[PDB]
Design a protein around this ligand. Structure first.
Ligand code: CLA
Ligand code: CLA
Ligand code: CLA
Ligand code: CLA
Ligand code: CLA
Ligand code: CLA
Ligand code: CLA
Ligand code: CLA
Ligand SMILES: CC1=C(C#C/C(C)=C/C=C/C(C)=C/C=C/C=C(C)/C=C/C=C(\C)C#CC2=C(C)C[C@@H](O)CC2(C)C)C(C)(C)C[C@H](O)C1
Ligand SMILES: CC1=C(C#C/C(C)=C/C=C/C(C)=C/C=C/C=C(C)/C=C/C=C(C)/C=C/C2=C(C)CCCC2(C)C)C(C)(C)C[C@H](O)C1
Lengths: 170, 104, 69, 151, 174, 139, 169
């Protein structure tokens, strides 16, 4: 969960910084989960279009993740002397002979992962109400004063207590 | 393929009796021994000038082109599929009996 | 209607062939009774020729059906 | 060769060793099912059985229930699955109360503590599997129809 | 005892380093479901057919045989299959490869029994593997190019299903 | 006297009619007998078995199943060398039949009469006299 | 053995036998007498060798008694069928005479009769090999010539010297 959140936190900051060539002409002005819905509107199966951007990610992440499934299943029943999180991935020597790393560097990994879980949750919800994205929100320390018109997500129901029960300042 | 022809697996047909199911040889030999005679053409509207194997394989491709839509009740797919698999299962049964039992 | 033909020497040929075929083949297959000069009697001859007129009639009618005649 | 022999070498027990009963494939399937798989606590046996059963329970209630043609069909189907789950957990608990004497053994299914563990795991996994089925059907239009969205 | 290709998984039990092309890659446990020797014979068969398929794709781009353009006008990769079922070519290759497969079926039964190595048909007329030092190199090399040709055959035929160009015409006309 | 557990059993191919879970948790019955031949008999629980020459042993769930086989062997093969035992899950074996070495239809000394009523059956007491009383209706 | 190297040696055949090449993939010699198999191979080849000439020569010259039809194959449908009935019974007489009443697998080879021999001589292993291989060639040849004459409806040499049209049916 921590590693996925760290990639998500880095992705949101970089997407606010720039985007890769040609992306802007397809997705338009969508940032931080609106781009997920926008791609999925133009992909076979979920929508109608010529893209498989989320689907390609699902394919390769799912192949790697069935491999990690077998690793987790073997580690659960004690058939393997492998610790948590260690997949042997360490191409440039960082732990100086062990892919698992030192006690300090895994403590660094776990704490930064916890930080990124909290942070990516914060960034997601602040976008879900302001529509600004990470750097505009952090710049706009007076907020709700002017917000970006942004689409309802693929789960609008969760935005139903914001109006009649909770204040809805926006 | 729960057990091949070679003495490799420990699959026991029952509690204590090991028995070599010859799933490669029986499946291959029964398929060829059923498909090759079935190539015999016939100028009947169901076959359309092909054999039963070839008209069947043609109706697989035709219905696969319209992939989500199933073949209709009057479509020749169902009758071709039935007769083909009927004679195929019969030739697998008889082939398994002949090969496992007589062993030659 | 399947097309049959009036009797000709080809029909005679099919009948004779099937008849001899059934004599020889029956002589081996029959389990209770000099390749044909040992134990060959009238019931064996009459049975092989009855199967000969059965195989021959089927062969004549089928070859007339398909066009071989 | 003969494929039917006395069960576990005993000619006078009330069973036979037939291919359905005792082949290698059958023994592999039986030995690997959560009820019989080795190395599992009764609670984990309960969780895996519950996740399976709760997941498939949602579907018949949703497709064929009284509110099936309404927009609350999935809500009613999930809640109907929940009602069946609660009734079945009551059945499991009363079975445990009347069938097992209280002993310290807790790692076998047929003990009082082992049955209570299995019931705890079965309720949690069952509600979890029903909730997962609810999420999947809610979001994917293929599952809402019978695959009929493609036509 | 960890898999070489997938470091976090236990080394496959049915698999061994004596096998040519071995890398410890069976994360799903399919080497236990079906017999390993059947799987090797199947893999080497697939390898050779796809090697032919890939080179045939490339060569059918590069040139065609005399008179072929008369019969095939615009059909390029799998359209030529469709028009040459009408002509006799596909029935001919099907008949003769099926003829070879009959003796291949005898040889598969033989290699199941254990007399023959998978994919071994003693076909070395030019005596490339006579030294035997090359033999092992050739064995591993054949498996590697076979796997690459399986991926390549798929990837070209799917590139042609997309564009219609075919491999070299896809490359030259980006 | 005691059951020699090692006695070979009659050849049998198995059946679904044999004993169930109550036999290994409540009680099982055993029958042993001597045969002069290797001959086919019918099992009380199902099909046919073959008794081995010499001494045979079976396990059945009910005592009546042991006695049904015993009557069948005595009439069909003239074998009276049968002994019926009751066996408990504690391992304790209870000899049952014939109980004192002599068959019940033949008289034996030292048998004490149980259940014998000193008058004829019409001399019993009417239910009303023995109502709210522990006194038995047999006089 | 030597013909199909990725299979086992049959081990029921040897280089002693005339036309041997170690070629027995199906293991037919394990289930039937090899004397009968040799006898069948030579006789089938001898009939095929006559059949090849029987398909070749009647194109150039057909007997004045008959009518030749269209091809030497199809000529059996235009000659009287009673003529071929006597062909059949005369060949049967030859079978019952040259074989001394022995017409079955248990019955042949009783006196030590060698497979090829019907009393026309004894030949070198090379000479018997020549006979066998020419027989095998003429067996394959008959199938090609007969089916060619069938589909084309033209004489073999008329087809060969004339435009070499593909066989189609
Ligand atoms: C899934 C996200 C996404 C999407 C939808 C696009 C979409 C597009 N990209 Mg971009 N791109 C992406 C990710 C994406 N890109 C990434 C991750 C990279 C790697 C750094 C690139 C690198 C890239 C380059 C270098 C270029 C594009 C270009 C293009 C456009 C192609 C027009 C054409 O004729 O193709 C022709 C080009 C190719 C077939 C291959 C290049 C198209 C709108 C081109 C562009 O701007 O067109 C206007 C261009 O030059 N893309
Ligand atoms: C080599 C000669 C020869 C030939 C060319 C044929 C050919 C034929 N026979 Mg004949 N037959 C033969 C020998 C031959 N048979 C012999 C030796 C016997 C044994 C006596 C028979 C007994 C036989 C019977 C009893 C019948 C035929 C029928 C048929 C025809 C239909 C089969 C069909 O498609 O039904 C397909 C039916 C299915 C159920 C397929 C599924 C077919 C043309 C049938 C027919 O319609 O005749 C007019 C028929 O009733 N045959
Ligand atoms: C699975 C493989 C496969 C398949 C299905 C096809 C199918 C087809 N090819 Mg392609 N082709 C292939 C491989 C394949 N080819 C290879 C390997 C090459 C050479 C690199 C070619 C080169 C080629 C050309 C140049 C042409 C075709 C054409 C065709 C069409 C008609 C058949 C023909 O004339 O073939 C001709 C093919 C060959 C002569 C190549 C045969 C190579 C052999 C089989 C390799 C085996 C050699 C080895 C020594 C034998 C050992 C046997 C062993 C088992 C013991 C048809 C659609 C024609 C067409 O219509 O194209 C538009 C055409 O002009 N093919
Ligand atoms: C299945 C594939 C296939 C097909 C359909 C054809 C079809 C044809 N070929 Mg080609 N050919 C093929 C494979 C094929 N060939 C192969 C594999 C070779 C050997 C390398 C040849 C070598 C060949 C030659 C040398 C010639 C033909 C010619 C011809 C044509 C006959 C025209 C005529 O007057 O005679 C005919 C359309 C002739 C022609 O006129 O075509 C230009 C000709 O001269 N063919
Ligand atoms: C064993 C011998 C054998 C024989 C007799 C034939 C006979 C034939 N082949 Mg086949 N063929 C064979 C082996 C054989 N083939 C093998 C081993 C292969 C490799 C897989 C092929 C691949 C093949 C193809 C791809 C084609 C034929 C074609 C033909 C036909 C050529 C007609 C023509 O005009 O010929 C005169 C031409 C020549 C003599 C050219 C040299 C004829 C049916 C052609 C056809 O129409 O199929 C029915 C065709 O396209 N053959
Ligand atoms: C030897 C393996 C191999 C190779 C070299 C190629 C190479 C190619 N394929 Mg093929 N492909 C392969 C296997 C292969 N593919 C397999 C196994 C599949 C599965 C069926 C496909 C399915 C496939 C499709 C569906 C498409 C390609 C496309 C492409 C091209 C652009 C690469 C691309 O967009 O990836 C992008 C690479 C990355 C994002 C890497 C990070 C390129 C010529 C595309 C193309 O342009 O062809 C029309 C395309 O649409 N291929
Ligand atoms: C009166 C007829 C007759 C008889 C009794 C024999 C007897 C014999 N022949 Mg001879 N033969 C004959 C006529 C005959 N032949 C003729 C006219 C031919 C064609 C030229 C042959 C061709 C021939 C060959 C090629 C072979 C024999 C062999 C044999 C021997 C074993 C088979 C047998 O017992 O008979 C069974 C045979 C017949 C009753 C007559 C056969 C005539 C043919 C096969 C026409 C049948 C038509 C039909 C397609 C058959 C298929 C059945 C089914 C599809 C309906 C035996 C010595 C075999 C052997 O090994 O010899 C030692 C052998 O290989 N014969
Ligand atoms: C060209 C093919 C050919 C060859 C090489 C042979 C060779 C042989 N045959 Mg066979 N045979 C053939 C054709 C052939 N025959 C045909 C067509 C028939 C059917 C009529 C027979 C019927 C036949 C029988 C019934 C017997 C033989 C026997 C023999 C052997 C003779 C023993 C001997 O004297 O030793 C020396 C060998 C020779 C002197 C043989 C000389 C080869 C001849 C003259 C072939 C010349 C062909 C010539 C160009 C004729 C063309 C005519 C055509 C255009 C119509 C020898 C191995 C006998 C034997 O022992 O079996 C092994 C035997 O009993 N053959
Ligand atoms: C491991 C490995 C390697 C690798 C690799 C990689 C790709 C490693 C990647 C590491 C990364 C990407 C780490 C990123 C962590 C992000 C964090 C901690 C931030 C959380 C955000 C917060 C707290 C916030 C906030 C915010 C709030 C809520 C409101 C917002 O409006 C704005 C704001 C931003 C202010 C390599 C390849 C070198 C090989 C090697 O041998 C092994
Ligand atoms: C792509 C997609 C979307 C999406 C999406 C995503 C990425 C959604 C991500 C949502 C996340 C990660 C929310 C995180 C919430 C974290 C919380 C409340 C932390 C509580 C911690 C506490 C209280 C700490 C307490 C404590 C502290 C402070 C100190 C004391 C100790 C302690 C108790 C630990 C959708 C769904 C929007 C729709 C869209 O169409 C498709």
């Amino acid at each position: 969960h921590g590693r996925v959140a760290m990639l998500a936190a880095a992705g949101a900051i970089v997407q606010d910084i720039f985007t890769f060539p040609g992306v802007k002409s397809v997705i338009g002005d969508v940032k931080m989960t609106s781009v997920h819905d926008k791609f999925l509107s133009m992909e076979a199966g979920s929508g109608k279009g010529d893209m498989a951007a989320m689907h390609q990610l699902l394919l390769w992440l799912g192949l790697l993740e069935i491999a990690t499934s077998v690793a987790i299943i073997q580690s659960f029943k004690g058939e393997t002397s492998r610790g948590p999180g260690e997949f042997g991935f360490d191409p440039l020597n960082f732990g100086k002979g062990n892919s698992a790393g030192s006690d300090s560097y895994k403590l660094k990994e776990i704490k930064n992962g916890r930080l990124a879980m909290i942070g990516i949750g914060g960034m997601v919800h602040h976008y879900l109400l302001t529509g600004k994205g990470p750097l505009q929100f952090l710049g706009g320390i007076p907020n709700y004063k002017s917000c970006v018109s942004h689409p309802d997500s693929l789960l609008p129901w969760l935005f139903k207590a914001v109006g009649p029960v909770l204040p809805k300042i926006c | 393929l729960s057990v091949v022809a070679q003495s490799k697996s420990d699959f026991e047909i029952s509690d204590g009796t090991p028995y070599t199911l010859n799933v490669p040889l029986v499946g291959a030999a029964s398929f060829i021994g059923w498909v090759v005679p079935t190539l015999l053409p016939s100028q009947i509207a169901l076959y359309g000038g092909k054999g039963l194997s070839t008209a069947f394989f043609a109706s697989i491709g035709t219905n696969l082109a319209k992939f989500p839509a199933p073949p209709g009740m009057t479509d020749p797919f169902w009758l071709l599929c039935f007769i083909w698999h009927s004679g195929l299962f019969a030739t697998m049964i008889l082939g398994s009996i002949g090969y496992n039992g007589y062993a030659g | 209607v399947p097309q049959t033909v009036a009797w000709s020497a080809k029909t005679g040929a099919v009948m004779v062939l099937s008849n001899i075929l059934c004599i020889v083949a029956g002589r081996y297959v029959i389990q209770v009774k000099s390749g044909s000069f040992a134990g060959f009697g009238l019931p064996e001859l009459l049975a092989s020729t009855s199967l000969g007129h059965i195989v021959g009639s089927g062969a004549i009618l089928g070859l007339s059906y398909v066009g071989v005649l | 060769s003969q494929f039917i022999k006395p069960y576990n070498d005993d000619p006078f027990v009330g069973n036979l060793a037939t291919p359905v009963s005792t082949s290698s494939f059958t023994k592999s399937l039986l030995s690997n099912l959560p009820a019989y798989r080795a190395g599992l606590s009764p609670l984990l046996r309960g969780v895996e059985i519950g996740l399976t059963h709760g997941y498939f329970l949602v579907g018949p209630f949703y497709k064929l229930g009284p509110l099936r043609n309404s927009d609350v069909a999935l809500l009613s189907g999930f809640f109907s699955a929940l009602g069946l789950i609660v009734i079945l957990v009551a059945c499991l608990t009363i079975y445990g109360v009347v069938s097992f004497e209280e002993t310290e053994a807790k790692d076998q299914l047929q003990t009082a503590k082992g049955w209570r563990q299995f019931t705890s795991g079965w309720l949690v996994g069952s509600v979890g599997g029903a909730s997962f089925a609810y999420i999947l059907i809610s979001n994917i239009p293929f599952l809402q129809t019978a695959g009929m969205s493609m036509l | 005892a960890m898999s070489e290709s997938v470091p976090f998984l236990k080394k496959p039990e049915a698999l061994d380093s004596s096998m040519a092309g071995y890398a410890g890659f069976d994360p799903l446990g399919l080497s236990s479901i079906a017999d390993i020797k059947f799987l090797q014979e199947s893999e080497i068969k697939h390898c050779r057919i796809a090697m032919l398929a890939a080179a045939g794709s490339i060569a059918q781009d590069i040139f065609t045989f005399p008179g072929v353009s008369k019969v095939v006008g615009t059909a390029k990769m799998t359209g030529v299959h469709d028009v040459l079922v009408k002509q006799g070519a596909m029935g001919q290759i099907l008949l003769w490869t099926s003829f070879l497969e009959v003796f291949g079926t005898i040889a598969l039964l033989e290699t199941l029994d254990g007399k023959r190595a998978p994919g071994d048909f003693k076909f070395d007329p030019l005596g490339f593997s006579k030294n035997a030092e090359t033999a092992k190199r050739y064995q591993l090399s054949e498996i590697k190019n076979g796997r690459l040709a399986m991926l390549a055959t798929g990837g070209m035929v799917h590139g042609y299903f997309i564009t219609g160009k075919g491999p070299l015409e896809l490359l030259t006309n980006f | 006297e005691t059951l020699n557990l090692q006695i070979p059993s009659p050849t049998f191919e198995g059946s679904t009619g044999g004993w169930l879970r109550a036999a290994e948790v409540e009680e099982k019955y055993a029958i042993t007998w001597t045969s002069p031949k290797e001959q086919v008999f019918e099992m009380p629980t199902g099909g046919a078995a073959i008794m081995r020459q010499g001494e045979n042993l079976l396990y059945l769930a009910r005592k009546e199943q042991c006695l049904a086989l015993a009557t069948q062997v005595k009439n069909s093969f003239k074998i009276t060398d049968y002994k019926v035992y009751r066996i408990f899950p504690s391992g304790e074996v209870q000899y049952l039949h014939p109980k004192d070495g002599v068959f019940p239809e033949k008289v034996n000394a030292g048998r004490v009469g149980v259940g014998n009523v000193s008058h004829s059956i019409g001399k019993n007491l009417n239910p009303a006299q023995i109502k709210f009383t522990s006194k038995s209706f047999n006089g | 053995n030597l013909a199909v190297p990725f299979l086992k040696a049959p081990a029921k055949l040897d280089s002693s036998m005339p036309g041997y090449a170690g070629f027995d993939p199906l293991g037919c010699s394990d289930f039937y007498d090899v004397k009968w198999l040799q006898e069948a191979e030579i006789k089938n080849g001898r009939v095929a060798m006559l059949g090849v000439v029987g398909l070749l020569v009647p194109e150039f010259f057909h007997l004045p008694m008959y009518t030749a039809g269209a091809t030497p194959y199809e000529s059996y449908t235009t000659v009287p069928a009673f003529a071929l009935i006597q062909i059949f019974l005369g060949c049967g007489a030859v079978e019952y005479f040259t074989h001394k009443g022995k017409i079955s697998p248990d019955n042949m080879f009783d006196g030590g009769r060698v497979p090829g021999e019907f009393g026309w001589g004894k030949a070198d292993m090379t000479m018997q090999t020549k006979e066998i291989k020419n027989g095998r060639l003429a067996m394959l040849a008959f199938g090609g010539i007969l089916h060619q004459q069938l589909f084309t409806k033209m004489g073999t040499i008329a087809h060969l010297t004339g435009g070499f049209k593909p066989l189609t049916f």
